Design a protein around this ligand. Structure first.
Ligand SMILES: O=C(O)CCC(=O)C(=O)O
Ligand SMILES: [Mn+2]
Lengths: 18, 429
């Protein structure tokens, strides 16, 4: 799920290391 | 304090210490080779193997190398396979493995490591809490919820489990149920509870049930550094950006974008109406639990700075028009989308995730009465063919009490004080 309008996800960004 | 040396490792402690001293002095390449030789000479030593893994971990940091880190993640696992590994070392190694897997975005790998940890240490509540975070990070709120239920059945006052249980309830729209868990969890002060996400959702759940304590929690969250202010509660911020609920076009500097939207508003309107009439399935209902009631749907042309090619087949002239403005089409923390809202709609007060965008609204079909939008303490209405601009990182709220539909076009832009360097490097949202 994406944080488009709100802040409902546990994290709004993806993890891709360095 | 932790016992890291099994019986054999005590007998080689002089060599193990020498290698670790190299790592602590920052001579990472020498330390890697020293531990590799110890692993060669003593292939069954858990401490030599953990030393190797830690040096690879540090080397990945130094080189900023995902591949070097993947090596470290494997060596941390090798530690756990060796005979006679001390319990403290086994936990440290697998916990770091999981942590680094999450850093790389290997969420399913981390989950497997965390499941193994809980199986190995069935009485360690903190590891069950970490397992719940693993599920949250992969989007599995159902399994996360079962994990925190299990923790709370053994340690009912674990504050970490309470705030995460409350977060999940809130996300499932169990608003009243979520409040005591979020509130008691923050009040516990347990490690991991002093977190902007829990202040954010506690205040929001309170607001939705009409509890006036909400702004006391926003004030505390501001005082503890989680929010830029009581009004502006976004959690993904660049500090210091000009903070203002309502913006004029001239203040944004995007006057060419605004002129194009206003001069060409009817074509944007007409393609939106054509999709409403002939391709209505492209409008997707709002799906972030932001409605008290009513019908609200959005047809998205760009998200995260990426054009939706199929959506743009539905509004080709609008997509062609907007392609000339990378301040919005490249806003990787914003969207470009039509937004239709029907009578009987109330959008809960909420805030967007980031202060890194401003949000433009172009009026397309605006009933003469009944529609308005509040941002912070100030309420406005739309006009057909005119752009409004607000910072949606401020709390905002919308009502639709007209007698027919209301259509707008939403265009996000990078905050104008963000440099090109910042716009290229910020993670997408
Ligand atoms: O009025 C609308 O269609 C959307 C309101 C809103 O919450 C926003 O634009 O962020
Ligand atoms: Mn909004």
């Amino acid at each position: 799920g994406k944080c488009k309008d709100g802040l409902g996800e546990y994290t709004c960004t993806s993890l891709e290391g360095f | 304090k932790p016992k890291l040396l099994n019986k054999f490792d005590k007998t080689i402690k002089a060599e193990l210490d020498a290698a670790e001293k190299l790592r602590k002095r920052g001579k990472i390449e020498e330390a890697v080779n020293a531990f590799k030789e110890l692993v060669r000479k003593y292939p069954q030593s858990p401490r030599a193997r953990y030393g190797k893994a830690q040096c690879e971990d540090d080397l990945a940091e130094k080189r900023r190398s995902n591949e070097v880190l993947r090596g470290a993640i494997e060596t941390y696992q090798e530690v756990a396979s060796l005979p006679d590994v001390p319990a403290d070392l086994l936990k440290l190694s697998l916990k770091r493995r999981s942590d680094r897997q999450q850093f790389l975005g290997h969420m399913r790998g981390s989950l497997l490591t965390l499941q193994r940890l809980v199986q190995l240490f069935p009485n360690d509540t903190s590891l069950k809490n970490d397992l719940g975070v693993g599920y949250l990070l992969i989007g599995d709120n159902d399994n996360a919820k079962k994990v925190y239920e299990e923790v709370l059945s053994v340690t009912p006052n674990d504050g970490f489990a309470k705030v995460h249980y409350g977060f999940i309830l809130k996300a499932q729209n169990k608003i009243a149920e979520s409040i005591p868990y979020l509130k008691e969890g923050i009040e516990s002060g347990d490690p991991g509870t002093d977190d902007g996400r829990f202040y954010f959702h506690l205040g929001d759940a309170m607001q939705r049930v009409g509890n006036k304590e909400a702004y006391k929690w926003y004030e505390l969250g501001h005082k503890r550094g989680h929010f830029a202010s009581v009004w502006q509660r976004s959690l993904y911020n660049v500090n210091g950006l000009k903070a203002q609920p309502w913006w004029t076009p001239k203040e944004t500097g995007y006057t060419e974008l605004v002129k194009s939207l206003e001069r060409n508003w009817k074509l944007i309107r007409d393609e939106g109406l054509a999709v409403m009439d002939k391709a209505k399935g492209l409008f997707l209902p709002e799906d972030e639990n932001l409605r008290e009631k009513g019908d609200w749907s959005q047809f998205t042309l760009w998200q995260q700075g990426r054009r939706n090619e199929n959506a743009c087949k539905g509004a080709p002239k609008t997509c062609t028009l907007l392609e000339k403005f990378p301040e919005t089409t490249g806003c990787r923390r914003g969207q470009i989308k039509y937004s239709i809202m029907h009578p009987g709609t109330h959008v809960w007060p909420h805030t967007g995730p980031t202060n890194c965008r401003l949000r433009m609204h172009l009026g397309l079909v605006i009933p003469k009465e009944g529609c308005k939008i509040r941002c912070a303490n100030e309420t406005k209405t739309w006009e057909e063919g005119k752009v409004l601009i607000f910072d949606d990182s401020f709390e905002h709220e919308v009502w639709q009490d007209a007698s027919s539909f209301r259509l707008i076009f939403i265009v996000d832009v990078w905050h104008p004080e963000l440099t090109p360097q910042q716009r290229r490097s910020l993670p997408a949202i």
